[PDB]
Design a protein around this ligand. Sequence first.
Ligand SMILES: Nc1ncnc2c1ncn2[C@@H]1O[C@H](COP(=O)(O)OP(=O)(O)O)[C@@H](O)[C@H]1O
Ligand SMILES: Nc1ncnc2c1ncn2[C@@H]1O[C@H](COP(=O)(O)OP(=O)(O)O)[C@@H](O)[C@H]1O
Ligand SMILES: Nc1ncnc2c1ncn2[C@@H]1O[C@H](COP(=O)(O)OP(=O)(O)O)[C@@H](O)[C@H]1O
Ligand SMILES: Nc1ncnc2c1ncn2[C@@H]1O[C@H](COP(=O)(O)OP(=O)(O)O)[C@@H](O)[C@H]1O
Ligand SMILES: [Mg+2]
Ligand SMILES: [Mg+2]
Ligand SMILES: [Mg+2]
Ligand SMILES: [Mg+2]
Lengths: 7, 7, 7, 354, 364, 364, 364
Amino acid sequence: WXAXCPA
Amino acid sequence: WXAXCPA
Amino acid sequence: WXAXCPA
Amino acid sequence: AALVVDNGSGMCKAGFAGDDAPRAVFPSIVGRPRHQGVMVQKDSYVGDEAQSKRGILTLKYPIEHGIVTNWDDMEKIWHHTFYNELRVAPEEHPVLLTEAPLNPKANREKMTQIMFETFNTPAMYVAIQAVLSLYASGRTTGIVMDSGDGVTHTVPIYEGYALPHAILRLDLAGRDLTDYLMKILTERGYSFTTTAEREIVRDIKEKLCYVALDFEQEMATAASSSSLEKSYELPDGQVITIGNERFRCPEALFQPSFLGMESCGIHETTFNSIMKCDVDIRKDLYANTVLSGGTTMYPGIADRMQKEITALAPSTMKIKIIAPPERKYSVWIGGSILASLSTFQQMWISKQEY
Amino acid sequence: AALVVDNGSGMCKAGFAGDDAPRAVFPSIVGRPRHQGVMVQKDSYVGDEAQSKRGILTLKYPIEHGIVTNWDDMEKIWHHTFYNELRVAPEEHPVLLTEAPLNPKANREKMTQIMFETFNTPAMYVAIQAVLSLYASGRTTGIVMDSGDGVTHTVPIYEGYALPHAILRLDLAGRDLTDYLMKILTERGYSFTTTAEREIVRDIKEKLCYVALDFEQEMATAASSSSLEKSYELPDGQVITIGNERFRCPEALFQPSFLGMESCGIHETTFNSIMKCDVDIRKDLYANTVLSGGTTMYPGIADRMQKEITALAPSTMKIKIIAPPERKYSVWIGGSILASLSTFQQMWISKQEYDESGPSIVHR
Amino acid sequence: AALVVDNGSGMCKAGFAGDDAPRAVFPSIVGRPRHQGVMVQKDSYVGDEAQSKRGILTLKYPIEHGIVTNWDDMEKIWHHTFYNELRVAPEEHPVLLTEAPLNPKANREKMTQIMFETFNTPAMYVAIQAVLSLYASGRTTGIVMDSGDGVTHTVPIYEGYALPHAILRLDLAGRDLTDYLMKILTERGYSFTTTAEREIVRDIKEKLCYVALDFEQEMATAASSSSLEKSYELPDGQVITIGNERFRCPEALFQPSFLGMESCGIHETTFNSIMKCDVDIRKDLYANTVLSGGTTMYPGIADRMQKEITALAPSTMKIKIIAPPERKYSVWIGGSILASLSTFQQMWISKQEYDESGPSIVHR
Amino acid sequence: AALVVDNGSGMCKAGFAGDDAPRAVFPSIVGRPRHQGVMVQKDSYVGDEAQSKRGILTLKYPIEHGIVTNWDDMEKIWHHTFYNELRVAPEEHPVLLTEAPLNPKANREKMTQIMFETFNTPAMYVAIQAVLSLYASGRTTGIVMDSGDGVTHTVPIYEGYALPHAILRLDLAGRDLTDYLMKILTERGYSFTTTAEREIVRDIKEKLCYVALDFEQEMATAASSSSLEKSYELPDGQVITIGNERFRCPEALFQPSFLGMESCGIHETTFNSIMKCDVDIRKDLYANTVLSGGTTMYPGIADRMQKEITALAPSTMKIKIIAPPERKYSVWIGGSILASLSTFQQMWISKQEYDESGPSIVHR
Ligand SMILES: Nc1ncnc2c1ncn2[C@@H]1O[C@H](COP(=O)(O)OP(=O)(O)O)[C@@H](O)[C@H]1O
Ligand SMILES: Nc1ncnc2c1ncn2[C@@H]1O[C@H](COP(=O)(O)OP(=O)(O)O)[C@@H](O)[C@H]1O
Ligand SMILES: Nc1ncnc2c1ncn2[C@@H]1O[C@H](COP(=O)(O)OP(=O)(O)O)[C@@H](O)[C@H]1O
Ligand SMILES: Nc1ncnc2c1ncn2[C@@H]1O[C@H](COP(=O)(O)OP(=O)(O)O)[C@@H](O)[C@H]1O
Ligand SMILES: [Mg+2]
Ligand SMILES: [Mg+2]
Ligand SMILES: [Mg+2]
Ligand SMILES: [Mg+2]
């Protein structure tokens, strides 16, 4: 992802 | 209805 | 709630 | 001076003797709240105060149709009349009361003790409403078409005295027309059923209803042309239109068969009442027909009464429907004249005689 | 044979006037999906088909208080009644309909136009619902106290033909009781808000609600023990127990102040309606009080009605509450008899007379 | 000095009678650690203390949809409110509580039990939140729409006499919008899933979200330019930008179909509540609409509410929306006035009245 | 025959429409050497070629949690899967894609741009992985718990209309289990660390570990004897023995607190999806649970799910877990059915439609 998580 | 109640 | 919703 | 208090069914009028118009004219409704109160309380609202908050009240008329239902509610309105609307105490000055024609003395006896004990008025005089209607018209002879909100009385009085045998009572009044109006208002889709909505229908009746000279001719005009349609604005902002209900509700007075009553109309009842008196005075009564009460304010009713009675009456008789513009307050206006008389002191029912 | 289509506020019944039970009985609801279709169904479902799939539909009632509020929707139910349930073409057989009394003129007028234009029925007739109920009971003089979902009308009838000046209509019926039940069902913690959840409440009302003989002593009895609590199983599987709410909902029929309405209860309304008749007729009407409609199917409502009317009525004269076991379809059965009755066959409003006059000819 | 503690779904406000603002306001959350401890504090953190250490705790809301779902956690908040925030003894001063309308009968029933056996308060009153909101404005007539954190309800009041049959309750409030905002935030790539991350979303909602006057026009505007995009900084230093989601999350209030709920919008609910009221009092309700609660603080919601009702309401009527700047604490401010009223001292539920009868006295 | 390419986090399946099994299946990894070639091949190896020589390459997963984190490697896999696996030019056959629900809009937007520009496919469609899995089962109502390598999503579907408000997505899948398994494998001394050594751990996961019926008794059983201990042979010839770790790594699916994630287990998530649905449709969803994806291939996961849901679900309810043997390729099989369905042949996205509007056409 962008914000939260990595992806 | 029209005047009074809903219908 | 008990029946319907969660609470 | 004296208080001309007219405890009429529906509109009740109060004022001082020697005046031209009643000072206080407020509805005779004792409303009570039906929904509970969560925040602030005036357990009972009486008169104009109840009308303003009529949305959350159960408006109960203490007088059904001449037959007083609650005698406790009547004292509440009389208490409201003196202390609130007039802000005067009947202790100093006598009061004058108006009486519906041909009523059981049981109604009168209870009325006598209330003024004399609950209010302690020095003097009081009970007078027939129909008799006082002609007094305000300036003539002591003739027939009075007393048609109020409750009960229509046809009293052809003579020399200022009502004829007990010639009085004919027709249970066809403004309230019955009001019920009939909302009964036929449901045809167009407008449904007024609760007591609060009843007052709304009455305002429509007083502002839009009128008597048609020819019922059959107007039906063709109403169906062919919607010119008779008129718009009225509800308190909530809604707009409604009535096409033929304007002259179908007042037409119930002349044709009671609309409401299932076997009795004849006011025009026929007026003709019947005249014949019950002696022949020698019949010509005098035909000329002097004075309408009274708020029911007879539908425009064109004098012309309709003139046309209907003329056909019923013989051609030799002459018909003159005297319709003063102040017929609603004539009962009160006549009472002011009677109380202002210097000779009125003789028949006062003083405290000693009680 | 003539169709007898008795469209009701909640449930509509269609038959053939040659039977004692309607051929097709389905709820008068049309539901439309409230979600998108990713499984690449019809645009809308009508009747019992919508009931089965009511979870994914927003159920809408085309009739509210005996007034057709959505004419486009009602043009579908009749299309569904003739072509899907009865499976008979209206163009060959006449159609009988029932309308509640004291209805707006435009409601029945538009009914005549649709059937004579969209369906092209050879003949049509609109009959008062209460009058049909009396013929089902084999009586010609009685005050029919009919109660459904939108209309609770008491029409006194004397030697037939009814009395128009004494017809009383009250807008408190089964649908209000359903809505009142969910308002008081939140008392115990059960929340039924959506339209789909409303039908579950209706099943609870039909199976567990009953009329108490005395409300005051029943309130105390339910508050001191648990013998009045009954368990109902939801479609999800949760078990819910309702106590005093079993008889509180039907009590709104006799005490409309619970819903905040100034109108008198059905027990007093029937008493008031009789008083509007002539003195001699009041002897016959009291002894021939006939209930009808599905609302009057509560256990013990007839006994409660007798007790309430007796107190209001004079003690010198008797009260007889007639409660036929088939009163749910009483309106349709009378229509079946009337359509098979020889007299009514001359009352068919034919197509040819319709075009010369228009839809306004139905009012008679 | 009567205590006025208003427990809400998101934040509970406590203070004193006679004041104008709450003394202590903190989120109504009880959180406990999930990761195992290593270095040698407390078992549970309640209030703003949980906010500071929200990165490690599992935040749980003891109140959901206006119903206390965990009485163990609820007792801690009250214990923390009295002995840590107000720092007063409840045994000497009465406590005024607020509850949502149409709540389960057992909800506040346990509330009476707790304050009468665990805290031994001398007296306690329970009042509807919407009723107290009208007190703060000083009005005596108007439809109070209280959109809180868990429950949104409209309770019309006319001259003090409330109308229970016109009370409409919606289970759509700020918490549902917070859950919806993080659902649509994943469209741009931001994923908030933990309950700790929910507070981050809630902070985003309270700062950048607003109600668009014309949703259809604004949607095209946001897709044709970049004027509506705003930048927000996460607690870890990350900078994120949100575009059309600013007016999409608050739009769910007016169009609950976004959440999949069949209930009507807040504009329809307010209009529908007025329709249930009588015709005479409708005039005094259109010009006296009162808003309250934190959810109704979106910039431009008052203007939007004016426009939406105007289309539904008759054109003759003049609709005036009252949006006081302090409507967040309108429930408490009105509650403070009630506790200080001289006439209100007779309606306190005394300790003697409770133990002699039981919790049955409440619900009166 | 329209191409049906399903790009997964761990493994991607590509084939042809109308067939029953994928034509070519290879792991979705792109690897490059971390050393220099002194001896006198290719810069990057993708697919099964990387797995064979994985001792030198650095395997990188282009897909993480169902989101394309590296579009350079995505172009390599698609270029390889068309010209080296299927041996078909993509300029003549339309291509169908599967994407996880609640994904960023940019993820499926750039998927649209690549094939319309780089491969110039005549048309293409993107469908939800869970929706396609129901097609393979031949059913039309059920909750598809699709657990893969990067994402785990449950999408309830009832009679065609899928509920978007009840769709739950979890970042708990096979790759998290693989990372967890190598973390607990260090307790026995085995220290698989490198990304090339991770694939060895996955092979252990795909052969030995299983889901226990109950966790508590198995912990005592494995710690009291050696019956559950199993031997595995490493590629270099070393032999390792793993005991209680067999039922600990898959246990993280039902107890995500082991990995530090606060999200509920797969049994609670699939139960929470049912509750968000309406009460009416819960009956047909309890008995039609469908499992899919490679994560749901553990021996005994179906029995464990049935036991866990039964405790949460009402006792009277009948819970049935459907676990077809081919559920590893369930998503692709459903996709092959869609591309052959006649009605779907018009739902594709034409090249002309893309040109006039742009990448935004895909979101509808
Ligand atoms: N201008 C009017 N047009 C039609 N009806 C009226 C008019 N004025 C009054 N009324 C009705 O006539 C009824 C009789 O009122 P009134 O004569 O003042 O009292 P009472 O009935 O006691 O004599 C009232 O109920 C009122 O609704
Ligand atoms: N056995 C019963 N017990 C309680 N309520 C019932 C029962 N049967 C029907 N009802 C209610 O009475 C209502 C009346 O329906 P019905 O009389 O069949 O048609 P209509 O819609 O014409 O009234 C129904 O909506 C139903 O909810
Ligand atoms: N300025 C604001 N903008 C947007 N949302 C707000 C604002 N202030 C409060 N809210 C939201 O409104 C909700 C209701 O909070 P509040 O009304 O203060 O107490 P209660 O919990 O009693 O409703 C809160 O959960 C909060 O997220
Ligand atoms: N029989 C099995 N036992 C244990 N794990 C498995 C098994 N089959 C597949 N898996 C795991 O499930 C994950 C997901 O693979 P799969 O569902 O085939 O494709 P996708 O990557 O699209 O989910 C793989 O990474 C694999 O490690
Ligand atoms: Mg008079
Ligand atoms: Mg019926
Ligand atoms: Mg609040
Ligand atoms: Mg997959």
